[PDB]
Every structure is written in structure tokens, then in C-alpha cells.
């Protein structure tokens, strides 16, 4: 029993993390087969970072301008190119610990594990959700640029996030491994605001099911609600509207607990309207929205 | 910026995890050099688990009764012994991925990373604190017996926890890697209750400092309190009493933020007395006590 924010074991990704230095600018890269992937921001000098023209900056470089270090061993760069906001450095050595992998883009509301890294050295691991506004509420300091986020299915690592920058609100923004930003951001050292966010309703409901599976039932009630009547309440509390396709995804959890989705919605409607009255759900005093239905099924039984 | 429950990268430990089977009973083991460490409970048949005499059970076994599997390769057992509640199986192959390691026992209030594992296969990673009552609020299902908890300093893995059992309240109990239980528990399949718990005051204060470092300041105030006047409030709210040695450990955080420890205590005293009034601290609506001062310094700047 128990329910915790839990990341995937990070070993498969740790073995791929390298340091990339261009002049005096340094950050983390991802070494898969004979290619290192990293934020193209590394080719900026201090005076290029505010308003870079990356095509200009890159044509002015050659392979020998890139220092790649996999622990103590220097990897020799033998080719370089740009794909959107990621730099690809072809190296002379294929990574012998390359896992089976994919580059997948995730949807808002989905979760992934972040391996925070500094100077090519992994530092910590934790779960994150892609917010509806395409930021993530991570934990990152200077030097974390190029840290990656991922999910692991069986033996295959699905890379979904490369960390670029911190926004002024303290939330974090990045790209997929094709270099395409999540959300309306650009890789410049200028202050950029996130759009308005909203709460991921299906995740909250999934978490309430996790709570019932784990014995918290004080919030249940005899009432049911209609899909449209719940959505009137959701709109008032900045929860995203609930659809039948979402009622569908909650099917297995509704079956395990024997609590109808629309019944669980009546509980959520009451919690939103009344608060929690000094009690807790799975050790939290607010409604948690960063667990997917899959996270619940993976962790409960 | 940001503050998250964050585990150590688990790769060094993943490479040590094996499956140990004795007859039909199976669980996880820890393979370091040419020794596998695992809960001695594995030598119990279904009918031995309620009231085992382990010395009896073990003398009735030979090396060939133990099946150890490191992934696909079977490790040959060439010796076996008991140390308290852990079995040590000497194998014919030294683990080529043995990290630099120590066996250390931790104190209540301290944190460690748990690598949850099933059938010798790592499943997830998350942070845990040793509660004052020597349980941990983990996330474990059937088959997790033998999962380990650890901290990593530089390159050295300090193993501090081997998971044994789940108590009826849903909390988890285990031993250090010498087989000595944390808390008043025994490795029998009988229902055992945890003693009364209490809140880890210095961790709450450390977390409030983390919040100030990260820009939550609404809970600060112009007041100070005396060490004894705070402790009268702490005793009323089941917080453990605060000592000068604890004021001392919070020194660096008090210096970074410029907020005196006893000033921060006046904030905590108010929060305990008034609640939080609909606001949050670092995304939580209750006072978090599972971050040590070291966890805060490791993650903030
Ligand atoms: C506080 N924080 C939270 N997350 C981050 C991530 N992050 C980072 O690690 N580094 C950045 N700028 C650099 C400065 C360098 C100085 N040297 C010697 N080398 C450096 C490398 C970088 Cl990458 N930035 C800022 C930033 C990085 C970008 F990739 C980008 F497109 C715009 C930006 F403003 C950063 O956010 N820091
Ligand atoms: C729900 N939960 C949360 N944590 C745990 C940990 N845990 C476990 O994984 N297994 C246990 N009993 C076994 C049954 C087996 C059946 N087969 C085929 N093999 C088995 C191996 C075990 Cl170890 N237990 C119970 C338990 C394990 C002990 F080590 C102990 F000393 C007393 C106990 F009651 C368990 O708690 N399950």
C-alpha cells in the first residue's frame, strides 16, 4: 500500500549523460549511439544569449569548437548540425550503454521522470507533469540546461523532454528531443511569461480513486452528478471540462473500486465547494492533479 | 528554482539488484562483490511465515536450495549464513558493477532514496524519511521484500534500509543492512503496531527556509519567540521539542535567508495556531516534515 510520486529507475539514462562545452558555455547532452543531443543554446557566448541568430552562430563553428566529455573520456566530434532548438554532435564513439529508445512528444496532463544533471553528472530524479500551459513545475538550478525527461516501458526509454530555461514565475520550459518547444517559448535569454494554467481534472479523479484503493473514503457520498452539471462547477474553479472520453479512461479504476465515475465527480464537486475541513487525502491537504490514471494503476493493485 | 521531493540517481543500485528464490518463496536481494544480502524471510515456506524459528529453518537448507538470478544469468550459491534478520549468500561471481559502498544506519528524521523492486527488477524510485516511530511511509506492493534504501555521497552508496514488511496501518518496516530492525518489530507474518509518531520540527523549519529561498514569504512576521515558549506550543501540536543543537544545524539556512531561527519559529507557531488560511507553501497546504536541512541545501542555492 501507499501512494507516492515515484520516478522510473534512472540508470538507463544516467549512462547517456555527457557534458558539452562550446568556448566557455557549458551544459548537458544526451549521448545515444554516435550522436550527442543538446540545447543549441550552448553555441552562444555570454553576449549572444539575449538575441542569437543560431544559423549565423553555427556556421561560424567547426567540430573542434565542441568539447564533449563522457565522464573522464573526451569524445571526438566529427560532425555537427541543427534540428530546431537541438544541436546534434556526431561523435567518433557509439555509446556502448545506449538503451533501446524512442523520441516521443507528450501531451499536457501526462507525467514523466526528470533526471536533473549538472556538468554532465546526474544529481537527482523526480516526477513531473506537463502542465496545460506547457510548463513544468520542476526543480532546477544553474547548469541544468540539457537535463532530460523520460518514461520507461519495459526496457525502452521514451525521451520526451529536454530542459532549456526557467521562466520568471519559477516554472520550467523546454523542448522535445526533436528540438520543438513545448508551448509558446523561444530559446533566448529574455523573460517570457507562461499562459494561464488550469487543473487537470482527470488526474484529480484518478488520484481520488488511488485514495479509495488506499483506504481514504471520508470524501465519498451518496450523490451522483451529470457530466454537464459537474462541468459548470469545474468552470467556476478553473478545472478543465470533463468529457466522455475521460470518463472512459477512468473505466478500469471505476471498476476496481466499484465507484461510478460520475459518482466520484459528485465527491470532487463537494470537495471544491466545501474544502477539506482539516482532513487529508493520501497525505495532502489539496487536490493533487499530477498523477495520471496510468500512474495510479502502475502503483496500486 | 523549485523544490521537489527528489531521489538520488538509482543506477548504481539498479546494477546490484537480484532475485532470490528458496523453494517457492521469492524476493529481492542486493548483490555486492561476491555476496547477496536479502531478508532471511525467504527461507520460510507459506506455513513457516507466521512463527518461524529461523535457526531451525536455515540449518535444514544447503547452498543448492537457493536460486539467485541476476537478470538472465543464474548465480551459483557457494555459502550461506545469517546475520540477524538478513541472509548472506556467498556466490561464485563477484558483481562487476559493485559501487563503492557503506552500510550505515540512519537516525529518525533523516531521508533516503528507495528503489522499489519486484522479482529482482527495479520498478520506481522515491524519497522517504525515517519516522520518529521507526516506520517509513513508502509505496510498496507484494513482492517488494528486499528493496533497499540508500543515499549517495559523491560516488559512494550508503545503504541504510532493507524493506521487510507492511504494518496494518499501511506504513512500512525494515532493517539496516546488518539485519537489525528499525523500531520494535520482528520478521514474522503477524500484525504489529507502530508506536505513536510525532512531527519532525527541524525538518519543518528547514522546509520553511526552502520556501523563503523560493519566494514564499507570506507566513513570515515581525515576532520572535523563546526556545521554551515555542516548545510549549510544539508539545500541544505533537511536534518534537526544539533544542539548541537543532537551532545550530539550521545555522547556514538562517544565514542565507537572514531570518533568525527563533524568528522562523514564531512563524511556525502562528501557522500551527492559525492554520494556513487557504494559502500554500511550496505547493503544499500542510506543514511538510520530510525534508532535512541537508535536502534543502542540496536542492536550493
Ligand atoms: C535557475 N535555472 C533553472 N533552470 C535553469 C536552466 N538554465 C541553465 O542551466 N543555463 C542557462 N543559461 C546558461 C548560462 C551559462 C553559463 N555558462 C558558463 N554556461 C551556460 C549555459 C547556459 Cl545554457 N539558462 C538560461 C537560458 C537557457 C537557454 F537554453 C535558453 F534558451 C535561454 C536561457 F535564458 C537556464 O535557464 N536555470
Ligand atoms: C503489500 N506489501 C507492502 N510491502 C510488502 C512487502 N512484503 C513482501 O513483499 N512479501 C511478504 N511476504 C512474502 C510472500 C511471498 C509469497 N511468495 C511466493 N514469496 C513471498 C515472499 C514474501 Cl517476503 N511480506 C510479508 C512479510 C515479509 C517479511 F519479510 C516478514 F518478516 C513478515 C511478513 F509478514 C511483505 O510484507 N508487501
XYZ file of C-alpha atoms and ligand atoms in Angstrom:
676
model
C 0.000 0.000 0.000
C 0.918 3.676 -0.055
C 0.930 6.254 -2.822
C 3.972 8.337 -3.692
C 5.255 10.455 -6.519
C 7.619 7.873 -7.970
C 10.067 8.179 -10.857
C 11.336 5.481 -13.174
C 14.713 3.966 -12.264
C 17.169 6.355 -13.910
C 20.154 4.092 -14.576
C 19.475 3.652 -18.290
C 19.518 7.443 -18.752
C 22.433 8.163 -16.387
C 24.696 6.174 -18.719
C 23.864 8.550 -21.588
C 24.563 11.889 -19.933
C 27.589 13.895 -21.074
C 28.959 17.427 -20.770
C 29.073 19.690 -23.827
C 31.237 22.816 -23.788
C 31.495 25.388 -26.569
C 34.072 28.012 -25.681
C 33.115 28.973 -22.141
C 29.426 27.947 -22.344
C 28.658 24.520 -20.910
C 25.604 22.322 -20.350
C 24.398 18.712 -20.501
C 23.998 16.477 -23.538
C 22.349 13.129 -24.300
C 24.635 10.530 -25.905
C 22.749 7.883 -27.926
C 24.623 5.658 -30.411
C 27.177 8.013 -32.053
C 25.201 11.269 -31.620
C 25.092 13.747 -28.727
C 21.882 15.818 -28.467
C 21.904 19.077 -26.517
C 20.343 22.568 -26.442
C 21.657 24.667 -29.285
C 21.987 27.486 -26.717
C 25.462 26.087 -25.929
C 26.895 27.825 -29.009
C 26.017 31.235 -27.541
C 28.676 33.302 -25.853
C 27.535 35.458 -22.935
C 26.874 38.304 -25.397
C 24.980 36.076 -27.860
C 22.402 34.698 -25.414
C 19.963 37.643 -25.440
C 19.397 37.838 -29.215
C 21.135 34.967 -31.008
C 20.851 34.170 -34.672
C 21.676 30.496 -34.333
C 22.214 29.870 -38.042
C 24.858 32.623 -38.017
C 26.439 31.331 -34.825
C 26.578 27.729 -36.029
C 28.097 28.330 -39.476
C 30.960 30.092 -37.635
C 31.802 26.903 -35.716
C 33.651 23.739 -36.695
C 33.684 20.332 -34.982
C 36.785 21.200 -32.959
C 34.909 24.054 -31.238
C 32.835 21.448 -29.319
C 34.247 19.758 -26.199
C 32.225 16.643 -25.276
C 33.189 14.778 -22.107
C 31.638 11.450 -21.080
C 32.949 11.319 -17.541
C 36.732 11.345 -17.857
C 36.948 10.429 -21.559
C 36.735 13.136 -24.215
C 34.534 12.232 -27.185
C 35.785 13.455 -30.553
C 33.209 15.465 -32.507
C 33.195 14.531 -36.204
C 30.058 16.338 -37.381
C 27.501 18.910 -36.251
C 24.030 20.014 -37.308
C 20.921 21.809 -36.064
C 17.421 20.404 -35.742
C 15.114 23.152 -34.478
C 16.344 24.018 -30.974
C 18.635 20.976 -30.508
C 22.221 20.599 -31.634
C 23.321 17.157 -32.852
C 27.031 16.409 -32.468
C 28.111 13.252 -34.267
C 30.957 11.650 -32.326
C 33.544 9.021 -33.210
C 32.386 6.605 -30.482
C 28.976 4.973 -30.221
C 27.718 4.918 -26.642
C 28.130 1.279 -25.515
C 25.310 1.740 -22.973
C 22.720 3.098 -25.425
C 19.339 1.754 -24.260
C 16.505 0.866 -26.572
C 14.898 4.269 -27.005
C 12.312 6.451 -28.715
C 11.792 10.200 -29.084
C 8.142 10.829 -28.230
C 6.292 14.073 -27.620
C 3.941 14.028 -24.647
C 0.550 15.674 -24.123
C -0.293 18.154 -21.390
C -1.520 16.336 -18.315
C 0.900 13.428 -18.812
C 3.823 12.649 -16.500
C 7.500 11.805 -16.947
C 10.670 11.341 -14.907
C 13.291 14.113 -14.886
C 16.965 13.304 -14.335
C 18.410 16.615 -13.161
C 22.068 16.853 -14.184
C 24.917 19.320 -13.721
C 28.128 19.382 -15.784
C 27.140 16.049 -17.280
C 26.721 14.491 -13.812
C 23.279 13.221 -12.729
C 22.108 14.825 -9.485
C 18.539 13.748 -8.702
C 15.390 12.188 -10.093
C 11.727 13.157 -9.728
C 8.341 13.013 -11.451
C 6.830 15.969 -13.349
C 3.569 16.585 -15.211
C 3.354 18.636 -18.398
C 1.032 21.471 -17.335
C -1.854 22.505 -19.607
C 0.113 25.685 -20.304
C 3.147 23.604 -21.416
C 5.416 24.439 -18.492
C 6.624 22.035 -15.820
C 6.983 22.694 -12.095
C 10.470 21.262 -11.764
C 13.478 21.753 -9.501
C 16.442 23.073 -11.473
C 19.463 25.273 -10.753
C 22.061 26.942 -12.972
C 23.826 24.316 -15.061
C 20.786 22.047 -15.503
C 20.293 23.003 -19.176
C 20.052 19.839 -21.248
C 18.651 17.591 -18.498
C 16.119 15.177 -19.969
C 12.703 13.807 -19.068
C 11.581 10.332 -19.988
C 9.333 7.353 -19.362
C 10.414 3.726 -19.411
C 8.171 0.995 -20.817
C 9.663 -2.443 -20.235
C 13.236 -1.860 -21.410
C 12.624 1.075 -23.799
C 13.312 4.682 -22.769
C 10.860 7.146 -24.344
C 12.597 10.524 -24.134
C 10.082 13.354 -24.083
C 11.723 16.495 -22.640
C 14.992 18.421 -22.884
C 15.284 21.195 -20.294
C 16.132 24.705 -21.622
C 15.157 27.536 -19.286
C 13.430 28.859 -16.196
C 10.639 31.400 -16.632
C 10.193 34.372 -14.274
C 7.461 32.589 -12.294
C 9.993 29.872 -11.457
C 8.444 27.245 -13.748
C 10.480 25.468 -16.400
C 10.305 25.297 -20.182
C 11.870 23.011 -22.738
C 11.559 21.047 -25.957
C 11.018 17.516 -27.132
C 14.088 15.679 -28.398
C 13.395 16.981 -31.929
C 14.048 20.478 -30.577
C 10.427 21.651 -30.806
C 9.427 23.704 -27.793
C 6.555 22.734 -25.576
C 4.424 25.864 -25.511
C 4.901 29.386 -26.893
C 8.566 29.861 -25.962
C 11.861 30.535 -27.780
C 15.448 29.762 -26.762
C 16.519 33.331 -25.990
C 17.641 34.772 -22.653
C 14.622 37.061 -22.459
C 11.826 36.978 -19.892
C 8.844 35.046 -21.263
C 5.548 34.500 -19.489
C 3.577 31.295 -19.306
C -0.056 31.439 -20.338
C -2.850 30.834 -17.857
C -2.962 27.324 -16.430
C -5.818 25.090 -15.330
C -6.256 21.971 -13.200
C -6.090 18.533 -14.852
C -9.485 17.130 -13.839
C -8.994 13.513 -14.905
C -5.791 13.328 -12.883
C -7.572 14.622 -9.771
C -10.248 11.950 -10.226
C -7.603 9.274 -10.793
C -5.901 10.374 -7.558
C -9.197 10.146 -5.651
C -9.509 6.570 -6.928
C -5.968 5.895 -5.701
C -7.118 7.200 -2.318
C -10.111 4.832 -2.187
C -7.841 1.942 -3.181
C -5.613 3.032 -0.259
C -8.466 3.406 2.270
C -9.302 7.138 2.312
C -13.082 7.213 1.850
C -14.288 10.105 4.022
C -14.890 12.246 0.914
C -17.303 9.813 -0.762
C -21.044 10.471 -0.754
C -24.365 9.016 -1.877
C -24.831 11.589 -4.642
C -24.193 11.463 -8.361
C -23.959 14.303 -10.846
C -24.401 14.800 -14.563
C -21.434 15.384 -16.847
C -22.772 18.854 -17.678
C -23.584 19.717 -14.059
C -20.037 18.883 -12.983
C -18.607 20.992 -15.813
C -20.491 24.054 -14.566
C -18.643 23.638 -11.259
C -15.329 22.850 -12.970
C -15.535 26.054 -15.000
C -16.010 28.058 -11.799
C -12.901 26.534 -10.152
C -10.592 26.594 -13.227
C -10.763 22.831 -13.712
C -10.696 21.649 -17.245
C -14.046 20.375 -18.575
C -14.719 16.660 -18.368
C -15.622 14.617 -21.455
C -16.943 11.125 -22.087
C -13.536 10.132 -23.461
C -12.169 10.953 -19.995
C -14.961 9.049 -18.236
C -13.787 6.199 -20.472
C -10.117 6.307 -19.428
C -11.169 6.098 -15.769
C -13.052 2.866 -16.555
C -10.650 0.332 -15.021
C -10.307 2.402 -11.832
C -14.083 2.798 -11.573
C -14.373 -0.979 -11.936
C -11.707 -1.852 -9.357
C -13.306 0.389 -6.715
C -16.925 -0.058 -7.801
C -17.451 3.721 -7.729
C -19.022 5.204 -10.849
C -17.032 7.986 -12.479
C -19.985 10.360 -12.183
C -20.343 9.352 -8.530
C -16.691 10.212 -7.904
C -17.374 13.528 -9.661
C -20.019 14.349 -7.054
C -17.295 13.920 -4.428
C -14.941 16.244 -6.301
C -17.738 18.794 -6.706
C -18.275 18.749 -2.931
C -14.537 18.987 -2.186
C -14.231 22.003 -4.484
C -17.240 23.657 -2.850
C -16.581 22.810 0.813
C -12.846 22.436 1.049
C -11.409 19.558 3.023
C -12.302 20.631 6.599
C -8.939 19.910 8.199
C -8.677 16.381 6.788
C -6.212 14.952 4.274
C -6.279 12.671 1.244
C -3.193 10.484 0.719
C -1.232 12.842 2.962
C -2.205 16.003 1.040
C -4.437 18.897 2.055
C -5.203 19.971 -1.527
C -6.476 18.205 -4.639
C -3.497 16.650 -6.455
C -3.578 16.769 -10.273
C -0.139 15.451 -11.333
C -0.942 11.706 -11.245
C -2.307 10.158 -14.435
C -4.659 7.151 -14.478
C -1.639 5.124 -15.636
C 0.445 6.336 -12.674
C -2.312 5.144 -10.336
C -2.671 1.728 -11.985
C 1.122 1.313 -12.103
C 1.405 1.940 -8.359
C -1.809 0.473 -6.889
C -3.177 -3.039 -7.431
C 14.310 27.398 -8.576
C 11.626 24.996 -7.398
C 11.523 22.483 -4.573
C 10.656 18.832 -5.087
C 10.986 15.550 -3.286
C 13.973 14.272 -5.238
C 15.747 10.921 -5.037
C 19.349 10.104 -5.819
C 20.015 8.703 -9.300
C 19.408 4.980 -8.830
C 21.661 3.465 -11.496
C 24.418 2.405 -9.105
C 21.884 0.411 -7.058
C 19.896 -0.977 -10.012
C 23.016 -2.871 -11.104
C 23.098 -4.706 -7.759
C 19.529 -5.976 -7.588
C 18.898 -9.709 -7.969
C 16.104 -12.213 -7.367
C 16.432 -14.795 -4.592
C 14.147 -17.834 -4.555
C 14.068 -20.535 -1.887
C 11.615 -23.248 -2.854
C 8.518 -21.285 -3.816
C 9.277 -18.145 -1.748
C 10.868 -15.311 -3.706
C 12.026 -11.747 -3.060
C 14.784 -9.256 -3.897
C 18.451 -9.378 -2.937
C 21.400 -6.967 -3.002
C 24.497 -8.252 -4.822
C 27.744 -6.586 -3.666
C 31.126 -8.153 -4.525
C 30.546 -11.932 -4.139
C 27.742 -11.740 -1.531
C 23.969 -11.417 -1.954
C 22.121 -9.839 1.003
C 18.390 -10.423 1.413
C 15.662 -10.821 4.065
C 16.019 -14.125 5.845
C 12.223 -14.443 5.483
C 12.886 -16.029 2.062
C 13.674 -19.370 3.729
C 10.114 -19.578 5.084
C 7.553 -21.716 3.334
C 3.964 -20.460 3.424
C 3.432 -22.445 6.646
C 6.656 -21.177 8.262
C 5.972 -17.445 7.891
C 3.687 -16.983 10.922
C 6.014 -18.447 13.578
C 9.419 -19.286 12.099
C 12.426 -20.454 14.031
C 14.987 -19.223 11.538
C 17.930 -21.108 13.033
C 15.952 -24.341 12.584
C 14.873 -23.411 9.073
C 18.374 -22.435 7.962
C 20.261 -25.493 9.242
C 17.834 -27.571 7.123
C 18.989 -25.822 3.934
C 22.080 -26.221 1.771
C 23.503 -23.864 -0.868
C 21.636 -25.622 -3.676
C 18.286 -24.707 -2.073
C 18.890 -21.040 -3.057
C 18.150 -19.835 -6.604
C 19.796 -16.448 -7.288
C 19.137 -14.804 -10.652
C 20.892 -11.623 -11.808
C 18.703 -10.858 -14.788
C 19.039 -13.856 -17.092
C 22.181 -15.362 -15.526
C 21.899 -17.712 -12.556
C 24.453 -17.063 -9.811
C 25.811 -20.168 -8.102
C 25.496 -20.092 -4.309
C 28.638 -21.415 -2.602
C 27.939 -20.455 1.015
C 25.165 -19.181 3.276
C 24.902 -17.591 6.709
C 22.613 -15.493 8.898
C 23.317 -12.070 10.355
C 20.332 -11.001 12.457
C 17.416 -10.650 10.026
C 19.476 -10.748 6.791
C 20.643 -13.799 4.895
C 24.071 -13.623 3.232
C 24.521 -15.877 0.202
C 28.119 -16.094 -0.974
C 28.147 -16.566 -4.743
C 30.803 -17.718 -7.195
C 30.766 -14.440 -9.163
C 31.684 -11.010 -7.838
C 29.311 -8.336 -9.107
C 31.309 -6.436 -11.768
C 29.174 -3.322 -11.158
C 29.676 -3.174 -7.377
C 29.781 0.532 -6.459
C 31.864 1.962 -3.670
C 29.537 1.397 -0.734
C 28.931 1.518 3.007
C 26.345 0.009 5.351
C 25.168 2.863 7.568
C 22.261 3.051 9.984
C 20.238 6.251 9.793
C 18.526 8.286 12.515
C 14.829 9.081 12.670
C 14.111 12.302 10.833
C 16.713 11.587 8.135
C 15.882 10.857 4.492
C 16.954 8.276 1.918
C 16.077 7.085 -1.580
C 14.087 3.858 -2.003
C 14.473 1.738 -5.137
C 11.272 -0.306 -5.193
C 11.912 -3.645 -6.905
C 9.869 -6.692 -7.880
C 11.310 -10.111 -8.776
C 14.758 -8.552 -8.846
C 13.618 -5.869 -11.321
C 13.720 -2.190 -10.280
C 10.328 -0.503 -10.621
C 10.479 3.040 -9.230
C 12.445 5.454 -7.087
C 11.334 7.928 -4.415
C 12.449 9.710 -1.248
C 11.429 8.580 2.260
C 12.071 9.854 5.789
C 12.632 7.553 8.755
C 9.714 8.498 11.026
C 10.328 9.103 14.742
C 8.483 5.836 15.363
C 10.895 3.988 13.011
C 8.425 3.298 10.214
C 8.508 4.770 6.721
C 5.566 5.974 4.639
C 6.557 4.177 1.459
C 4.810 2.776 -1.606
C 5.239 -0.993 -1.792
C 3.232 -3.924 -3.157
C 3.549 -7.696 -2.792
C 6.967 -8.809 -4.000
C 8.841 -5.698 -2.816
C 10.533 -7.519 0.094
C 14.264 -6.873 -0.054
C 14.077 -3.479 -1.794
C 16.760 -1.174 -0.418
C 17.058 2.445 0.664
C 20.226 4.444 0.281
C 21.959 7.795 -0.016
C 24.751 8.628 -2.431
C 27.640 10.893 -1.436
C 29.890 11.631 -4.398
C 30.369 8.126 -5.801
C 29.724 6.097 -2.612
C 26.367 4.416 -1.944
C 25.465 4.371 1.763
C 22.863 1.617 2.105
C 20.610 2.226 5.087
C 17.366 0.242 4.662
C 16.211 -3.208 3.562
C 12.432 -3.468 3.191
C 10.711 -6.348 5.073
C 7.008 -5.805 5.713
C 3.908 -3.645 5.694
C 2.182 -2.927 9.003
C -1.621 -2.835 9.348
C -1.700 0.976 9.155
C -0.118 0.725 5.701
C 3.304 2.001 6.801
C 6.469 0.027 6.146
C 9.089 -1.566 8.372
C 12.553 -2.908 7.729
C 16.141 -3.307 8.864
C 19.541 -1.840 8.219
C 21.875 -3.901 6.048
C 23.206 -5.662 9.174
C 19.717 -7.115 9.626
C 18.848 -5.048 12.710
C 15.279 -3.805 12.604
C 14.429 -0.150 12.755
C 11.957 0.040 15.617
C 10.249 -2.594 17.782
C 9.420 -5.116 15.047
C 10.246 -8.761 14.245
C 10.292 -10.609 10.915
C 7.149 -12.683 11.461
C 3.906 -12.595 9.473
C 1.946 -11.292 12.447
C 0.202 -7.933 12.767
C 2.440 -5.465 14.612
C 1.548 -1.898 15.501
C 3.753 1.138 15.170
C 4.186 3.303 18.238
C 2.890 6.858 18.358
C 4.574 9.234 15.931
C 5.410 12.926 16.116
C 6.323 15.702 13.684
C 9.997 16.369 12.893
C 10.248 20.041 13.881
C 13.682 20.827 12.450
C 12.609 19.475 9.072
C 9.514 21.699 9.063
C 11.713 24.715 9.821
C 14.196 23.691 7.126
C 11.299 23.453 4.650
C 10.082 26.937 5.615
C 13.594 28.205 4.856
C 13.426 26.446 1.483
C 10.168 28.321 0.904
C 11.740 31.714 1.677
C 14.650 30.867 -0.625
C 11.990 30.089 -3.271
C 9.927 33.261 -2.673
C 7.069 32.194 -0.365
C 7.172 34.772 2.436
C 3.521 35.383 3.353
C 3.947 33.368 6.573
C 6.784 35.496 7.979
C 6.140 38.001 10.761
C 7.844 40.623 12.913
C 7.724 38.472 16.050
C 10.301 36.280 17.724
C 9.825 33.614 20.363
C 11.891 31.945 23.047
C 13.079 28.365 22.688
C 10.975 27.377 25.709
C 7.905 29.315 24.559
C 7.957 27.552 21.194
C 8.302 24.163 22.894
C 5.110 24.763 24.877
C 3.308 25.145 21.540
C 5.159 22.208 19.966
C 4.090 19.923 22.806
C 0.455 20.884 22.221
C 0.630 20.039 18.485
C 2.707 16.815 18.769
C 5.841 18.441 17.369
C 9.064 17.250 18.809
C 10.767 19.711 21.186
C 13.389 22.021 19.741
C 16.925 22.164 21.152
C 19.908 24.457 20.728
C 21.693 21.704 18.799
C 18.840 21.956 16.277
C 18.997 25.761 16.195
C 22.656 25.124 15.357
C 22.028 22.822 12.378
C 19.726 25.451 10.853
C 22.594 27.971 11.012
C 23.573 28.067 7.328
C 19.927 28.379 6.238
C 19.313 31.151 8.773
C 22.372 32.930 7.374
C 21.426 32.563 3.702
C 17.938 33.991 4.296
C 18.849 36.391 7.104
C 15.949 35.084 9.211
C 16.838 34.093 12.764
C 15.908 30.547 13.721
C 13.818 31.810 16.632
C 12.145 34.283 14.271
C 11.229 31.449 11.905
C 9.878 29.601 14.955
C 7.438 32.449 15.584
C 6.129 31.856 12.057
C 5.717 28.131 12.695
C 3.965 28.863 15.994
C 1.483 31.086 14.139
C 0.958 28.530 11.350
C 0.228 25.819 13.918
C -2.209 28.094 15.748
C -3.969 29.736 12.786
C -3.699 27.221 10.002
C -2.791 28.407 6.536
C -5.993 30.289 5.565
C -6.380 28.862 2.072
C -2.792 29.613 1.034
C 0.036 27.224 0.181
C 3.746 26.877 0.893
C 5.853 25.319 -1.884
C 2.679 23.835 -3.356
C 1.542 22.196 -0.092
C -1.384 23.023 2.174
C 0.148 21.397 5.269
C 3.479 21.678 7.072
C 5.960 19.294 5.414
C 8.391 17.480 7.738
C 10.214 15.003 5.451
C 12.931 17.366 4.146
C 16.146 17.579 6.158
C 18.337 20.703 6.304
C 20.739 18.819 4.013
C 17.954 18.113 1.496
C 17.195 21.841 1.395
C 20.831 22.893 0.960
C 21.368 20.184 -1.676
C 18.435 21.470 -3.734
C 18.437 25.253 -3.163
C 21.375 27.633 -3.617
C 17.921 28.689 -12.474
N 17.697 27.738 -13.554
C 16.745 26.829 -13.589
N 16.853 26.160 -14.734
C 17.888 26.673 -15.398
C 18.347 26.183 -16.749
N 19.285 27.090 -17.378
C 20.701 26.776 -17.413
O 21.141 25.811 -16.910
N 21.615 27.682 -18.064
C 21.094 28.857 -18.671
N 21.996 29.759 -19.328
C 23.372 29.342 -19.337
C 24.380 30.028 -18.696
C 25.686 29.524 -18.791
C 26.870 29.997 -18.256
N 27.844 29.174 -18.629
C 29.274 29.087 -18.417
N 27.286 28.162 -19.412
C 25.953 28.389 -19.510
C 24.906 27.692 -20.170
C 23.615 28.202 -20.071
Cl 22.602 27.069 -21.018
N 19.707 29.175 -18.651
C 19.235 30.381 -19.283
C 18.754 30.032 -20.693
C 18.985 28.778 -21.248
C 18.519 28.513 -22.531
F 18.729 27.295 -23.117
C 17.838 29.493 -23.230
F 17.390 29.223 -24.484
C 17.603 30.738 -22.676
C 18.066 30.997 -21.400
F 17.852 32.217 -20.823
C 18.782 28.290 -17.995
O 17.650 28.591 -17.993
N 18.418 27.640 -14.693
C 1.749 -5.158 0.488
N 3.167 -5.068 0.809
C 3.835 -3.954 1.025
N 5.097 -4.273 1.298
C 5.192 -5.601 1.244
C 6.470 -6.364 1.489
N 6.242 -7.783 1.666
C 6.556 -8.718 0.601
O 6.964 -8.364 -0.441
N 6.342 -10.129 0.807
C 5.843 -10.568 2.062
N 5.636 -11.970 2.277
C 6.009 -12.815 1.175
C 5.110 -13.580 0.464
C 5.601 -14.373 -0.585
C 4.939 -15.223 -1.452
N 5.841 -15.752 -2.271
C 5.821 -16.683 -3.380
N 7.094 -15.243 -1.931
C 6.937 -14.394 -0.885
C 7.855 -13.604 -0.143
C 7.357 -12.823 0.896
Cl 8.792 -11.995 1.575
N 5.538 -9.665 3.119
C 5.033 -10.166 4.373
C 6.207 -10.317 5.341
C 7.522 -10.179 4.913
C 8.551 -10.320 5.838
F 9.860 -10.197 5.458
C 8.252 -10.593 7.160
F 9.266 -10.731 8.054
C 6.944 -10.725 7.588
C 5.924 -10.583 6.666
F 4.621 -10.707 7.055
C 5.732 -8.252 2.928
O 5.460 -7.540 3.819
N 4.021 -6.106 0.945
